[PDB]
Each structure stands twice: as C-alpha cells, then as structure tokens.
Symmetry: D2
C-alpha cells in the first residue's frame, strides 16, 4: 500500500468514517487529472487507492471532502475540503500515510513517509 | 480589513516572515481567478488584501507558498504549498482571520471569524 | 508584557472567551507555586500576567481550564485541562506568546517567542 | 489494550521512536501516583501499559517526555513535556488511544475513545 489516508474527528474523539477522498495527479499540460478515489472505513482508514506500478513520480493532490462529512452530520463547517499537495517518489518509491484531524473550523494534516 | 492571514513557524517558534500568499476567487466556470496576494510581514501577518466592497460571497482559496519558505531555511519540506478553501458568508460575522501553523511535514489551519 | 496567552475555539471559529488560566512557577522542592492567573478577554487573550522584573528564568506551567469552557457550551470534553510546561530562557528573545487551539477531544499549542 | 500512546514527528515525517512516557493516577490524597511507563517503538507506538483489571476509574495524566526526545536528537525544544490529563472509565471501561504530533516549539494531542 504505497498511499494511505487516515482521518480523525476531534469533536467526537473517534475515527472519521465515510469521508470521501479524491486523489489527482498533475498532467503534462499542468491540469489536475483524476487519479484515484475512495472513502474512509469504520476505522477512519482508506486503503487500496493505488499500486506500486501505477503510483509513479509526480505532483499529487489529496482532496479530503470535509464539508460533505460535516454536513452529512448536520454541522455547518468553514472549509470546503482539506487539500494536501506534494511531490511523490522523486527519490524512488516511498510509502505515504496522509493523516488529518478535523474540527468544524480547523484541520491539521501530517505525512508519514517510509522507505520499504 | 475583511480578510487577514497569519502564518507561524512551529520549528523556530516565530512568525513566518516573507512568505508569499495568493488568494483566488472561484469563477462561474469553476476556474480559480487571481484575487489578491502579498508577503507576510515581520509579524507573520498579511493585511490589506481586500476591501469590504470587493469581498463578496463566494468560494475563495488561500495558497501559502510553504515550500519556498522551508527551502530558504535549508530544510526539505513535504508539501508544495498549503491551501485553505472556504466559502465567505454574509450571514456570519464579518472579519476572517486565516491562521496557519507550519512544520516541514505538517500544517494546521484554523479560521477566526469575528464581528 | 513578557508573557501573553491566547486561546482559540476550533468548533466555533472564534476566540475562546472567559477561560480561566493559571500560571505556576516550579519551586526548588519541585512543587508548583501559584504565580499569576486571570480570564481570557473577548479577543481570547490574557495580558498583564507578569512583569519583566518578576519573570525570571525557571520552569513554568500554564494551565488552561478547558473542561469548564466546554461544559458552559453544553459539550462534553475529554481533557481535565490543557497544560503547557516550558523553561523561560534569558538567552532567547524576550516576549513569550503561548497559543492554544481547543477542540472537545484535542488541543494544540505553540510558542511564539519574539524580541 | 485499554490505553495506547502514538507519537509522530512533524519535522521528519516519521513515527517518533524511543519517546519516554510516564502515566500517573490521582490518589485519594490528591497527589499523582506513578501508574505505568514505557517508551515508543520503531512504529511510534506504546502498547502494554496496563490491563483492563488495573485500569480502573480515575483521573490520569499521560506525560510524554518531548524535551528528552528532541535533546537526544541534538535539538533545543521549547516545552518540557506534553501533558494529557483526563478522567477515564467513568461510564464503564473504554479503550483510549492518546496521539501526539511533535515539533520543536509546538505539539498537538488528540484522543480516540472506543467502546469494546
Ligand atoms: B493548528 O495547530 C495550532 O496549534 C494552530 C495555531 C494557529 C494560530 C494561532 C494564533 C492565531 C492568531 C494570533 C496568534 C496565534 C498570535 O500569536 O497572535 B495573533 O495574531 O493574535 C492556527 C492553526 C493551528
Ligand atoms: B494535526 O493535529 C493533530 O493533532 C493531528 C493528528 C493526526 C493523527 C495521526 C494518527 C493517529 C493515529 C494513528 C495514525 C495517525 C496512524 O497512522 O495509525 B494510527 O495508529 O491508527 C494527524 C494530523 C494532525
């Protein structure tokens, strides 16, 4: 699993379940091409987005759909989504975990990058 | 000052100085149109971005060029930049502070919306 | 103002108002001695805690009574309070801002140390 | 595992390894009695601190020794440690994960509380 996303809810003190995530990759013409998508599980985790073969060098954008999450819970949040934009695999293949902690008016994101 | 941006450095415990910040307004065809920009001050703040007349309801994106900031300090960072995307709403209070706390592999952002 | 405290609310996107804050100084026998206290203002800030003469080098603890803040809003929180423990050092810059961002099950804190 | 601690390093983008953690429990006389301690693994995780039988109702303090961590890496950080103080198990037994994200002048902590 070269790319995984984990999301927590800071209001409930729980995983953030059923959060939609869309991944994009910058194309040769500088536009954002759709790359993969999914939604977090009961554990707040999203596995299986991509494969080592498919996850080549590039600039990637991980869009976490925080507004749809909070709205689905009847809350009116500030942000449209959380965007995480990074260059991947430019010193060879790595494994990336993108973690996010959500509140209605705030979010934090961190990356864990390991060499397999 | 309907819109202010404040950036802090979690490695040095200081304002993040001379960081470029670009604000964009989502257009009817979903593209991002330049709206305002500047560089944070010695206190990590960027004032004077817009006026109440110009800052109408809509979706806005604040892009903070974190990568150049870290490179200038000799540190290799993870993100290309930090992005804060939000809807301005006339119902709610009238002044928006977008704050961001920067680390090489992480950032946090919060909105302080007051009258 | 050698020491300032600023508290923000991540659920409502606002200053955290009327929050009690207690500062303690570690004594030679390792107990925590009351040093200064107050309540955050309408802007979430507490100024005037100490003076440069009194704020000598040493270990200090800032306790933010987050539990009462959330209960007053009708929200059940996790922490008894937030604690920020640090050494004041004359070498480094002279003004300390302790900032804290509050959620029911989480908090973040950073130090902004300037001259 | 009723109590687990996970620590990440926001400068390196990695687990925070070999972080000492001391847990205390408030006694009947209002003092902090030592309850359990350990250090994080190569994965940044600390398991096996306590048992369901031992982890009774009480007010607990989890002290994460961030200064010793940063100093062991030759860095001069701001905080002495990160303290996480909470009432546990007062509506029956729960499982607690205490997570922390560290920088030299900043830290964030969140709790994940589940009912087994
Ligand atoms: B994310 O995790 C954080 O700890 C954090 C902190 C902040 C912003 C704190 C802040 C806001 C406004 C002001 C200060 C600090 C300050 O020192 O002076 B101020 O201009 O009044 C944002 C996001 C995250
Ligand atoms: B920003 O401010 C935060 O407090 C924060 C917290 C996190 C969470 C990271 C995390 C917690 C638990 C677990 C992982 C990651 C993980 O990879 O596995 B796990 O043990 O289930 C992210 C960002 C921010």
């Amino acid at each position: 699993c070269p790319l995984m996303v984990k999301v927590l809810d800071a209001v409930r003190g729980s995983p953030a379940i059923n959060v939609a995530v869309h991944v994009f990759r910058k194309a040769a013409d500088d536009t954002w091409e759709p790359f993969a998508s999914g939604k977090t599980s009961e554990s707040g985790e999203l596995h299986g987005l991509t494969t080592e073969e498919e996850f080549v060098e590039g600039i990637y954008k991980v869009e976490i759909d925080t507004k749809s999450y909070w709205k689905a819970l009847g809350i009116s949040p500030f942000h449209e989504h959380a965007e995480v934009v990074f260059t991947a695999n430019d010193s060879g293949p790595r494994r990336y975990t993108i973690a996010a902690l959500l509140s209605p008016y705030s979010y934090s994101t961190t990356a864990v990058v390991t060499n397999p």
